[PDB]
Ligand binder design. Structure first.
Ligand SMILES: CCCCCCCCCCCCCCCCCC(=O)OC[C@H](COP(=O)([O-])OCC(O)COP(=O)([O-])OC[C@@H](COC(=O)CCCCCCCCCCCCCCCCC)OC(=O)CCCCCCCCCCCCCCCCC)OC(=O)CCCCCCCCCCCCCCCCC
Ligand SMILES: CCCCCCCCCCCCCCCCCC(=O)OC[C@H](COP(=O)([O-])OCC(O)COP(=O)([O-])OC[C@@H](COC(=O)CCCCCCCCCCCCCCCCC)OC(=O)CCCCCCCCCCCCCCCCC)OC(=O)CCCCCCCCCCCCCCCCC
Ligand SMILES: CCCCCCCCCCCCCCCCCC(=O)OC[C@H](COP(=O)([O-])OCC(O)COP(=O)([O-])OC[C@@H](COC(=O)CCCCCCCCCCCCCCCCC)OC(=O)CCCCCCCCCCCCCCCCC)OC(=O)CCCCCCCCCCCCCCCCC
Ligand SMILES: COC1=C(OC)C(=O)C(C/C=C(\C)CC/C=C(\C)CC/C=C(\C)CC/C=C(\C)CC/C=C(\C)CC/C=C(\C)CC/C=C(\C)CCC=C(C)C)=C(C)C1=O
Ligand SMILES: COC1=C(OC)C(=O)C(C/C=C(\C)CC/C=C(\C)CC/C=C(\C)CC/C=C(\C)CC/C=C(\C)CC/C=C(\C)CC/C=C(\C)CCC=C(C)C)=C(C)C1=O
Ligand code: HEC
Ligand code: HEM
Ligand code: HEM
Ligand code: HEM
Ligand code: HEM
Lengths: 354, 55, 92, 95, 117, 92, 241, 354
């Protein structure tokens, strides 16, 4: 496979005009490898019968075990930041217009990542972990006997932890396989450029693009090392360091920051099932944004007003999730949801002719 | 001939269904857990006005 | 004869065995002739979707009655030694 | 793959991508040959097993008889050791 | 025993040579057609007999299997290969690596190793 | 991993019938195995004579050294093999 | 020098299509409760395992309720005592191994949960060991508290001969003799090791028989397709039709 | 990859003259998949803090958990039987003479399998498990501080179990990857035939060879199901159902049947290191059997006397391992080792000319 490596790294041609926003994908691939490696190493010391006492044991007793603990937690935050920024990037340039297969391959990795991150959060085995999974699992209480089969008991226990751990161990490996389908489609279906059209200015990847990609990934590392060792940003809720009490709920029951958008959607809509369905809508609806267009154009490099409103809409929904369930927040959040629906309809609808 | 090759598939599918169902069945709450999830209250010996707690 | 040497060769009775070719003889044709009258090929095997249905529905019914038959066999062999066969007498 | 002479193709039609291995096992037949066969649906499918049964087992056994002397020698070693072990144990322990 | 095995298959000793050996392959390139035709037919009959667990009829077994019919061509092939070894392969040559489907370490066929897939 | 090796029932010589244990003069049932001990000892007479010889040899030792455990174990194994063939016939 | 191998006792469950003899299992538990349980523990055997398999549910409740189990903490943080229930394991005679060794002259009675399959010979080892207590071999003198058993490794075991005729009265009326009790307790301990033994064999019977039918179908298929190959005729200078 | 499947299964050509001994490889591939699948499922219920109590829990409490427990243990025995028979097959026909790359790829899988099986045996956490690893690890006590790093303590503990479990979980997945290199070399370097020479009688795999391979694998399944449900052969030592006692050794300390050959080699040679080196010799020496030959011949289809003596030599060495360390057995075992060396020298040495 040295001739396959040479055809996809050494003699792989890319346009010269790409920005640093085209370096995000490379960063995702590298940090993903780190998360898998640190996970395997952490499991050499972790105790699944009591995740609470395992983390303490790693941080205090293992030599340099604090590095493994904090890298795995903090690098998961970095995985979602970089992936979400990659999604925003793709939305801005409308790379899905012609490279839809690339978009589909990516969305599968997004769906897998959501499951990976959530179960991992449960493995901490703190107050938020226990109560977060208890709340989410009740959403499927409509389907008979489905909760009992998944949990393995009538309440979440170590039985549930043992089975979720296997999914957390294995699913990330499948995600890496899907990354190869993603790269296959990128190399066959050539990448988009900052300009709409296709132009003859490509250069080889190893001598030029890889050097620029390393410069970007080293710049992100300078920031990640500061967060890793000094916690300049609060990215992990403190409530997960409280021992589980099944009779007393914590002050608030919220997931990590990267699930806040979906958390607020549920907290806002009155009917539980409607909340779940709106969550389904947001991820699935963006898969067919360009499917109804009829004109010869990719809607690229206009003022991108709808795009900007959508990005701010994600940010505001994330902000509402942090706040308590105040009635006034509920009203405004509902307006944002309605506003988001209108924005998506603007994307979908084709234009008539004057 | 097609009966013989059909029978190979017939038996194979039956073995496959048994395997799948049996594996999924193992995820059901285990015999110890199902047993612990049922407590019988002997209302014998309680007195009017008494409150007792059962986990 | 010659067994166990470089002179080994097929004995006469093996040569006679291989001289019986049974050319033009079919002693099992009755079985296929009667089997064909079940019309399984016309009804089920010929069409792929019906071929699948035969395997699925046959496996369903076959598996159940196969289990049923051997459960009765087990009950007969172990007669008098099963928990259900020996109701327990409570001590006084 | 076979030799270069064997796999050298006469036709100029390109090798399909799903038949790469199939055409690496090509042979260059010298002098031609006539191949004949009949569909199994019009043949006896079990008689050949019975027809070939006695000669198959005769030739199998005569070939395996070559290992008669080696196996007997190993077996002779197996017996000596087993009874050398018994005598040693009794001499060292039994009274 | 070897003579009997050859006679049972109806093959010659020189038929038994495997063409995965390079000297055999180079010799087989230059054998005349009449020798080639009978060699192929004998080898085909042997494989049919062996596969079907049968032996050649004794009527056809009275021949000497150890006639060295390939000897003239094996010796020519060895001479050709020794000349090539000496005049063209007397040093470990440096070539650009993993280019044109070939590792660059000496083999001459494209896609003939795992690392050249 | 498991307690026993399975076999066909024809290989397992399970008692066809049950003979009740003998009763003592006092009226208490006597152990079937003890009743079978003298018989099985006779069937293992060859090993028993070898053990009996060892006892006499160690008896005629000025030193205290000497044991007959090895011969006794061979006799005991033989006697138990005899008991196993017939004991379950007397046990419910 | 390896321990004498047990003889092959003809237990009912040894055959392919045979179950555990429940009446013998019932008698085996009586022996264990009244004889073996004084020194040995069955940590991994629970009362619920016996419900609807050896005894009816009400009977098992009475057996469990006979014993007392330390349970807690209560609201004041104290440990209390309660009667047993179906969820409890079999009671342990001693609180820890050190206590067991002290009461047994430094010998630890092993837990009997898996002893039916933990020795070479399996169930046969238990039956043979219980009935393997003979007078010592001439020239072998055992320190007090050691007894001669032909099957225990080394020949000297710290277990007093546990079975004596008339030790217990069987509920079903079976005569109580040493050999009978050894047979029953061996049966019961075999069941305790693998209570799913009957389920395994019944399902195995269906699979094994079905696999034979599956072998015939693939064989017919294999014969059919290979007839095309094994009957071909390749000719060179000849032609026959 | 549907055109790669079609080129390696549908239109893959093999000689018609192969025996059922060519079906062994297919059986290894199928049973290997089963062992990986049943392992993953077993880990949904297994307790690594006490492997002894986990097995009991699976056998008694999990529905059909006895099937998972016994299949995983018994199928490991079947994996070694089939693999060893495949090795004997390759030795008999001297398939290594020209297809050495296939032989090398296979030996790597053999080396990995040895490690996989041994650590798995330790995960049982019985008397033999604890004492087996304690004895083997002492072989490397010569290398300073190496035992402490591997065990993670001064004696084997759950710390050692946690790290060995990760190797047991991951290494089998790497073994499956090496199976693809093995199949790649088999398909490129054509397989050997029962006859020495190469002949024009190949047929496609899916319609003929796969049907025959299924017939063989179904015949082996009829035997495996009998062992699985009724234990007709004692393939697991009973001593591993005794709880671990670090102060008292068991009656005998031996591995599974498939490690007996190497166990006896150590038990026989007086010096510990010499025993380890002779173990290294046996597996490595068979990699260069044909390297010194100079004649145009593959030594195929002679009376194979040396081969038969070697196979019986393996069987006799396996027999000596079962027996106690009696002095008389030690002497005979040493003769067998010397005899084995002479047999290998017969394989290696080229012949002079009269
Ligand atoms: C890669 C390598 C490979 C890897 C492999 C993987 C390895 C993984 C690791 C291993 C993991 C561990 C586990 C390993 C386990 C291995 C062992 C194992 O699996 O064992 C399983 C299993 C072990 O046994 P078991 O599982 O305990 O047994 C279970 C029971 O047997 C049966 O089960 P059960 O009892 O639970 O269920 C029984 C039940 C199950 O029941 C059902 O499923 C039946 C119901 C199905 C209903 C379907 C309805 C579908 C249609 C719906 C409607 C559609 C409408 C659409 C409309 C559209 C409109 C637009 O069926 C019945 O009760 C039977 C009767 C059914 C009657 C149905 C009547 C239908 C009426 C419909 C009426 C509708 C009218 C409507 C009108 C109104 C409309 C408005 O194996 C077997 O049993 C082996 C069997 C093999 C076959 C045997 C048969 C052989 C036959 C031989 C024939 C040749 C001889 C011929 C002789 C001829 C003489 C002349
Ligand atoms: C008490 C304390 C004691 C301390 C002691 C400390 C001792 C330290 C020892 C250090 C190591 C010494 C090793 C000596 C070996 C001598 C063997 C010999 O006589 O060779 C003659 C022999 C010539 O044989 P010949 O029959 O006369 O002709 C050969 C051809 O048939 C026809 O030949 P031709 O000349 O006609 O063909 C032309 C071609 C012929 O080309 C070849 O023969 C090349 C063959 C293919 C090589 C690539 C194999 C594929 C990759 C394998 C590795 C896979 C995984 C790697 C990554 C894993 C990452 C996890 O020649 C050239 O291309 C000439 C230039 C070659 C150099 C090119 C430089 C760039 C490429 C870099 C790789 C090659 C570096 C040189 C070899 C290094 C040897 C260690 O030449 C070779 O053996 C060639 C090298 C092949 C082996 C490469 C091994 C690499 C290392 C692998 C790991 C090893 C770990 C095991 C322990 C290592 C320590 C021992
Ligand atoms: C008294 C003490 C004695 C101690 C004994 C031990 C002595 C120490 C040394 C032992 C090791 C020796 C290594 C020899 C290296 C030979 C290099 C070489 O020439 O290779 C080419 C050569 C091919 O020759 P060629 O055809 O002439 O070369 C011309 C072509 O250009 C050649 O090109 P080609 O393509 O035809 O062939 C290349 C061939 C070369 O490869 C091989 O054949 C295997 C070579 C390496 C062997 C394995 C080494 C393992 C050891 C290191 C690990 C130890 C860990 C320890 C940790 C401890 C922690 C506590 O295949 C490959 O390169 C396959 C590569 C596959 C890689 C797949 C990776 C996964 C996919 C990609 C990455 C993942 C996806 C991305 C994921 C991203 C995530 C986002 O290889 C061979 O023929 C030999 C293969 C090895 C045979 C067995 C060797 C036995 C050694 C004797 C001693 C054994 C003692 C017993 C051991 C028992 C163990 C249990
Ligand atoms: C209550 O507060 C709240 C939170 O905090 C608690 C939230 O996080 C959230 C948001 C949370 C989320 C959006 C995610 C929640 C995630 C959950 C509940 C994960 C639960 C666990 C699972 C789904 C594990 C089961 C795993 C799977 C089904 C695999 C998932 C991946 C899939 C299906 C993609 C493709 C399929 C695969 C990769 C499977 C591959 C299968 C194989 C390899 C099988 C092979 C088999 C053979 C025989 C060969 C909300 C809304 C909230 O309200
Ligand atoms: C005492 O009684 C006795 C026994 O019973 C106890 C015996 O079994 C035996 C025989 C036993 C054996 C022959 C086997 C014994 C096995 C043992 C001791 C296993 C110990 C555990 C290990 C070796 C685990 C460590 C694992 C490895 C080193 C991997 C092994 C596989 C290798 C090296 C092949 C190729 C390498 C790999 C597959 C590793 C791959 C590496 C990666 C993917 C790393 C990637 C990293 C990055 C950054 C990308 C004897 C002789 C005996 O006397
Ligand atoms: C009731 C009839 C039984 C049964 C079925 C068993 N025992 Fe005991 N036992 C005791 C002690 C101290 C030991 C330790 C071993 C020795 O003494 O050195 C044992 C051991 C066993 C075993 C295991 C034998 C071995 O291989 O270690 C078995 C299967 C066994 N016992 C069964 C002590 C006692 C008693 C105290 C007086 C009583 C009562 C019993 N045992 C009763 C039984
Ligand atoms: C994209 C890949 C993955 C991400 C997003 C991820 C995410 C996380 C999260 C958020 C945590 C809990 C953080 C905390 O404790 O608060 C966690 C824990 C854990 N993960 Fe992962 N994980 C991934 C891959 C893996 C892999 C591949 C393994 C093992 C091979 C693994 C093993 C573990 C283990 C053992 C824990 C428990 C340690 C803990 O308390 O942090 N993870 N994971
Ligand atoms: C595990 C997460 C993923 C990784 C490893 C990853 C990696 C990559 C890389 C390396 C590229 C090529 C270089 C680049 O454009 O930066 C890229 C391109 C692309 N990705 Fe992803 N991706 C991931 C997630 C996603 C997701 C979730 C989507 C869709 C919502 C997506 C859609 C795309 C698109 C459309 C392109 C084309 C870029 C272009 O045309 O310029 N990716 N990705
Ligand atoms: C060729 C592949 C493998 C073989 C040879 C093998 C071998 C074995 C052995 C012999 C046992 C112990 C048997 C006993 O308990 O006495 C075992 C246990 C175990 N194995 Fe594997 N194994 C393999 C693959 C795997 C895989 C892929 C996993 C997990 C994904 C796994 C997980 C386990 C677990 C959890 C246990 C403990 C359960 C036990 O007590 O048996 N194994 N292995
Ligand atoms: C995980 C273990 C392995 C599996 C999956 C496996 C699988 C296979 C399969 C499918 C074949 C092709 C069909 C066949 O000939 O039966 C084969 C061929 C072969 N294997 Fe393996 N193998 C394994 C272990 C080994 C080992 C340890 C060796 C060497 C000691 C080896 C050496 C060979 C050789 C020489 C051939 C060529 C067969 C021939 O030329 O006819 N294999 N193997």
């Amino acid at each position: 496979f040295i001739l396959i490596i040479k055809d996809n790294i050494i003699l792989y041609n890319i346009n010269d005009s790409i920005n640093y926003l085209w370096n995000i994908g490379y960063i995702i691939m590298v940090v993903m490898i780190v998360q898998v490696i640190t996970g395997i190493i952490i499991n050499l010391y972790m105790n699944i019968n009591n995740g609470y006492k395992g983390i303490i044991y790693i941080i205090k007793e293992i030599y340099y075990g604090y590095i493994l603990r904090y890298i795995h937690n903090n690098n998961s935050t970095l995985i979602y930041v970089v992936v979400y920024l990659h999604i925003i990037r793709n939305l801005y340039y409308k790379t899905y217009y012609y490279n839809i297969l690339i978009w589909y391959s990516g969305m599968i990795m997004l769906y897998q990542l959501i499951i990976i991150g959530f179960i991992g959060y449960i493995l901490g085995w703190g107050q938020l972990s226990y109560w977060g999974i208890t709340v989410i699992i009740n959403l499927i209480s409509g389907i008979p006997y489905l909760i009992l089969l998944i949990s393995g008991n009538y309440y979440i226990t170590i039985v549930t932890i043992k089975r979720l751990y296997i999914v957390h161990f294995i699913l990330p490996i499948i995600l890496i396989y899907v990354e190869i389908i993603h790269v296959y489609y990128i190399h066959y279906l050539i990448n988009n450029n900052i300009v709409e059209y296709n132009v003859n200015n490509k250069i080889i990847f190893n001598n030029y693009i890889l050097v620029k990609d390393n410069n970007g990934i080293i710049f992100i590392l300078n920031i990640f090392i500061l967060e890793l060792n000094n916690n300049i940003f609060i990215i992990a809720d403190n409530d997960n360091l409280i021992e589980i009490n099944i009779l007393v709920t914590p002050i608030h029951i919220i997931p990590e920051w990267y699930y806040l958008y979906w958390y607020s959607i549920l907290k806002l809509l009155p009917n539980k099932y409607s909340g779940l369905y709106i969550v389904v809508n947001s991820i699935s609806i963006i898969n067919i944004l360009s499917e109804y267009k009829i004109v010869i154009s990719e809607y690229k490099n206009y003022k991108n007003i709808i795009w900007y409103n959508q990005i701010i809409q994600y940010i505001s929904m994330i902000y509402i999730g942090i706040q308590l369930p105040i009635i006034e927040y509920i009203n405004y959040g509902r307006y944002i949801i309605i506003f988001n629906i209108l924005l998506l309809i603007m994307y979908l609808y084709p234009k008539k002719k004057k | 001939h097609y009966f013989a090759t059909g029978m190979f598939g017939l038996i194979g599918l039956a073995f496959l269904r048994g395997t799948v169902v049996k594996v999924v069945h193992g995820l059901w709450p285990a015999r110890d857990a199902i047993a612990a999830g049922v407590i019988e209250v002997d209302l014998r010996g309680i007195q009017p006005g008494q409150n007792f707690v059962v986990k | 004869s010659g067994f166990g040497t470089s002179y080994a060769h097929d004995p006469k009775w093996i040569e006679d065995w291989m001289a019986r070719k049974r050319v033009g003889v079919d002693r099992m044709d009755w079985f296929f002739r009667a089997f064909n009258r079940l019309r399984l090929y016309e009804l089920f095997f010929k069409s792929t979707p019906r071929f699948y249905a035969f395997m699925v529905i046959g496996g369903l019914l076959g598996s159940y009655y196969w289990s049923r038959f051997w459960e009765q066999y087990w009950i007969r062999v172990n007669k008098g030694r099963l928990y259900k066969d020996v109701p327990y007498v409570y001590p006084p | 793959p076979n030799t270069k002479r064997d796999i050298r193709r006469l036709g100029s039609y390109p090798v399909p991508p799903e038949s790469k291995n199939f055409w690496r096992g090509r042979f260059q037949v010298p002098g031609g040959q006539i191949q004949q066969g009949v569909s199994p649906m019009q043949q006896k499918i079990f008689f050949q097993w019975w027809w070939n049964l006695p000669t198959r087992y005769f030739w199998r056994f005569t070939k395996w008889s070559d290992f008669l002397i080696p196996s007997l020698m190993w077996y002779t070693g197996f017996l000596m050791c087993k009874n050398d072990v018994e005598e040693g144990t009794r001499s060292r322990y039994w009274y | 025993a070897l003579v009997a095995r050859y006679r049972g298959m109806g093959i010659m000793a020189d038929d038994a040579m495997n063409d995965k050996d390079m000297i055999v392959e180079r010799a087989l390139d230059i054998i005349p057609e009449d020798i080639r035709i009978q060699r192929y037919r004998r080898m085909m009959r042997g494989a049919v007999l062996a596969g079907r667990k049968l032996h050649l009829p004794l009527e056809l077994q009275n021949y000497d299997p150890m006639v060295p019919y390939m000897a003239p061509y094996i010796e020519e092939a060895k001479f050709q290969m020794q000349e090539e070894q000496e005049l063209l392969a007397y040093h470990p040559w440096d070539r650009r690596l993993y280019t044109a489907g070939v590792s660059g370490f000496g083999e001459t066929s494209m896609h003939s190793t795992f690392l050249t897939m | 991993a498991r307690a026993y090796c399975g076999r066909f029932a024809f290989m397992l010589d399970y008692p066809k019938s049950y003979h009740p244990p003998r009763k003592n003069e006092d009226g208490d049932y006597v152990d079937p195995r003890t009743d079978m001990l003298p018989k099985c000892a006779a069937e293992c007479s060859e090993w028993l004579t070898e053990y009996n010889a060892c006892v006499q040899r160690i008896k005629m030792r000025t030193d205290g050294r000497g044991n007959c455990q090895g011969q006794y174990e061979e006799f005991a194994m033989c006697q138990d093999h005899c008991i196993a063939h017939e004991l379950f016939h007397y046990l419910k | 020098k390896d321990p004498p191998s047990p003889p092959d006792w003809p237990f009912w469950f040894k055959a392919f299509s045979h179950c555990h003899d429940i009446p013998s299992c019932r008698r085996g538990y009586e022996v264990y409760r009244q004889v073996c349980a004084t020194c040995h523990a069955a940590r991994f055997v629970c009362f619920r395992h016996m419900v609807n398999t050896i005894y009816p549910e009400n009977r098992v409740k009475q057996l469990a309720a006979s014993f007392d189990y330390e349970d807690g903490p209560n609201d004041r943080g104290e440990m209390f005592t309660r009667p047993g229930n179906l969820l409890d394991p079999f009671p342990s005679p001693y609180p820890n191994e050190e206590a067991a060794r002290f009461a047994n002259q430094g010998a630890s009675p092993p837990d009997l949960s898996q002893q039916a399959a933990a020795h070479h010979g399996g169930c046969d080892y238990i039956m043979s060991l219980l009935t393997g207590y003979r007078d010592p071999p001439a020239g072998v003198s055992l320190r007090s508290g050691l007894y001669y058993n032909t099957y225990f490794p080394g020949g000297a075991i710290s277990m007093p001969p546990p079975l004596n005729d008339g030790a217990i009265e069987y509920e079903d009326g079976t005569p109580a003799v040493a050999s009978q009790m050894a047979k029953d307790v061996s049966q019961f301990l075999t069941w305790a090791q693998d209570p799913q033994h009957d389920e395994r064999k019944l399902i195995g019977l269906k699979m094994s028989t079905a696999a034979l039918v599956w072998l015939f179908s693939i064989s017919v298929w294999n014969r059919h397709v290979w007839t095309m190959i094994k009957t071909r005729r390749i000719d060179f200078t000849k032609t026959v039709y």
